[PDB]
Amino acid sequence: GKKIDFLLSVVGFAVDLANVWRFPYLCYKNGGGAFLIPYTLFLIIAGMPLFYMELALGQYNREGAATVWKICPFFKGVGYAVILIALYVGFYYNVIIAWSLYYLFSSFTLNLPWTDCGHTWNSPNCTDPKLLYSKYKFTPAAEFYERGVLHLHESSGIHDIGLPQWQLLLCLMVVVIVLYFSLWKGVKTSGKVVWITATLPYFVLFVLLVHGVTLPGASNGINAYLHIDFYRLKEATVWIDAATQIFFSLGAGFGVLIAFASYNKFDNNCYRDALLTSSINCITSFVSGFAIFSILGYMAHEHKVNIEDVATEGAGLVFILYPEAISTLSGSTFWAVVFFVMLLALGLDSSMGGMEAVITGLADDFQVLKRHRKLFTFGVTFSTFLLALFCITKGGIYVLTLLDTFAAGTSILFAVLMEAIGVSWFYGVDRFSNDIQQMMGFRPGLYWRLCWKFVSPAFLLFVVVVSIINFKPLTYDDYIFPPWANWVGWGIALSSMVLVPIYVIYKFLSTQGSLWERLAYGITPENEHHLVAQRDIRQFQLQHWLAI
Ligand SMILES: CNCCCN1c2ccccc2CCc2ccccc21
Ligand SMILES: [Cl-]
């Protein structure tokens, strides 16, 4: 049972709302198959080594994202930045779970609300295929999503977001209460019911794939998915999106992997865990893309439009597509209930760890918080609830789009780049390899050390620079955000990016001694500070810097 339970746990972690909700519309937005080449390249080159590095760091040091930097005191700013990014993500990651809960509540009927027009939310322009360069938006499913759930028709833009929708308000309250009561006792919440949260997503995906392959237009969708537009690979939008999606999907750069690995056994095999998680993530993402493109190829045929204009390119793509596919199944109410229960379970389980990252990271830094986990959990959860109330307004989709663009973009790329630089160069890739050997019994291969020191940092720096210099003003379908929205988004990104230099400055100023003494204290592990008075600093020799 040692292996079956391990396989089930890794498969449960490898599937989340990233693959099922975000990856579909990022793949649709970037043409289809042309998004997979950069995705796989980044996966290998940067994602797998960084996942391995974070797991090893957490396992060896037994600390969270903030306090793990006792080895290199100058990067506690990086730790704080990743904690802040994790805090930002929840604000809308929980709004997506609220959407799922609302859809589940709406699915308890013999006539699904998204099957035809004729409802109070339907507009005169609603067009039903059965009863008779834009994104269409006049289908029953799109009309339901945008008017009976979002009520987006009551907001003219991000300047007129309006008041929170009360139904989504109740759903968000329920989600927040469930999160709090699942996090208020401690980190130990696995191995009890996660079994059904690990197999249900794959059963749902398999049934969706099998049924959608045999649909009238699925062939065209599959052809578009497998076609590669090589001109799209010369624009850097696909590359930036692929890098951000890889780091979001795998979970690196948020302080979650380090926090959870801090509770591992000192001899746990992090290499095997990283390999299996990455492989399962890639396969699941590919299958999700296949199913999604089959569904929208079917829709292109049914609605008599081009496949590029069938659906939205935003965060509601799955909430449009999956209901459309469900409506084609036999006994569609049962399948809708099953699918939205699966979405609820996936989202709640993932958000649990997402918030645990923040809680553990800040409790390791302050013991007062560690002594009062209930109050601290309540505070974190309540703050998330309010800043998510900001995202369930009539124009809450605009705020959600801005957040999904800026909270973890260049910010997360920069944070992961700083993490890799810190470890590999300042702490020492040789020291890191020695720690991994002391833990798991073998030294990492040359490929892993090369990726940690040279390859991953180079690609991360390139992608950060390209994302900064090739920045497209924010949009949502046919809506263009005002420039101040772009300024606000870049400010949100900087709020996390800037913690690193600020903490470097603060650590330098708060230390006592001469300039060289301050540097030695700042780049020396906290448990070897007695060697600084001995003028024996490894980093002050070329051997440390040329070591691989
Ligand atoms: C790993 N896929 C993302 C799943 C959710 N995610 C969350 C959730 C809420 C807040 C932050 C984050 C950061 C990324 C991450 C990392 C590990 C588990 C979950 C999450
Ligand atoms: Cl993904």
Residue 264, domain CATH: 1.20.1740
Q: Is residue 252 part of an annotated ligand binding site?
A: no
Distance of alpha carbon 78 from the chain centroid: 18
Residues 547, 459 share a domain: no
φ and ψ at 38, to 5 degrees? -60, -35
Instruction: Look up tokens 């001995």; give the residue.
Output: 534
Q: Residue 289: name the closest of 279, 278, 301, 281 by CA.
A: 281
Three-class SS state of 480: strand
Residues 534, 390 share a domain: no
Dist. CA 285 → ligand 2 center (Å): 5
Q: How far apart are CA 5 and CA 12, in angstroms?
A: 10
Residues 256, 130 share a domain: yes
> Could you tell me the two tokens for 41?
């390249």
Assess contact for 333 and 358: CB atoms under 8 A: no
Q: How far apart are CA 84 and CA 21, in angstroms?
A: 23
Dist. CA 360 → ligand 1 center (Å): 14
Residues 348, 229 share a domain: yes
Dist. CA 278 → ligand 1 center (Å): 15
Dist. CA 353 → ligand 1 center (Å): 7
Q: Is residue 330 part of an annotated ligand binding site?
A: no
Nearest ligand 1 atom, CA 17? 4
Residue of 19, 85, 91, 93 with the most ligand 1 atoms within 8 Å of its CB, for mutation: 93
Three-class SS state of 427: helix
Nearest ligand 1 atom, CA 408? 13
Nearest-CA residue for atom 14 of ligand 1? 251
Residues 133, 99 share a domain: yes
Dist. CA 81 → ligand 1 center (Å): 15
CB neighbourhood size of 160 (10 A): 12
Residues 489, 531 share a domain: no
Residue of 254, 387, 404, 411 with the most ligand 1 atoms within 8 Å of its CB, for mutation: 254
Dist. CA 17 → ligand 2 center (Å): 9
Enumerate residues 6+ apart whose C-beta is below 8 A from 93: 17, 347, 350, 351, 354
Query: Which of the ligands is closest to the CA of residue 82?
Result: 1
Q: Residue 122: name the closest of 139, 107, 98, 136 by CA.
A: 139
Query: Which of the ligands is closest to the CA of residue 255?
Result: 1
Residues 463, 539 share a domain: no
Q: Is residue 223 part of an annotated ligand binding site?
A: no
Residues 537, 410 share a domain: no
Residues 282, 189 share a domain: yes
Residues 444, 506 share a domain: yes
Q: Identify the burial level of 268 via C-beta atoms within 10 angstroms of its C-beta, where 0-12 means exposed, 13-18 middle and 19 or more buried.
A: middle
Q: How far apart are CA 282 and CA 275, in angstroms?
A: 11
Ligand 1 binding pocket, CB closer than 6 Å: 16, 18, 86, 89-90, 93, 248-249, 251, 254, 256, 350-351, 353-354
Residues 520, 503 share a domain: no
Query: Which of the ligands is closest to the CA of residue 27?
Result: 2
Q: Is residue 408 part of an annotated ligand binding site?
A: no
Dist. CA 144 → ligand 1 center (Å): 28
Sign of the Cα pseudo-torsion (126, 116, 92, 291, in order)? negative
Nearest ligand 1 atom, CA 257? 17
Residue of 10, 13, 16 with the most ligand 1 atoms within 8 Å of its CB, for mutation: 16
The whole domain housing 273 covers 2-510
Assess contact for 323 and 112: CB atoms under 8 A: yes
> Could you tell me the two tokens for 509?
């100023």
> How many domains does the structure of the chain reveal?
2
Nearest ligand 1 atom, CA 250? 1
CB neighbourhood size of 199 (10 A): 15
Three-class SS state of 38: helix
Task: Identify the bridge partners of residue 164 per DSSP, sorted by sequence position.
Answer: 393
> Which amino acid, one-letter code, is at 517?
E
Q: How far apart are CA 306 and CA 2, in angstroms?
A: 51
Residues 62, 79 share a domain: yes
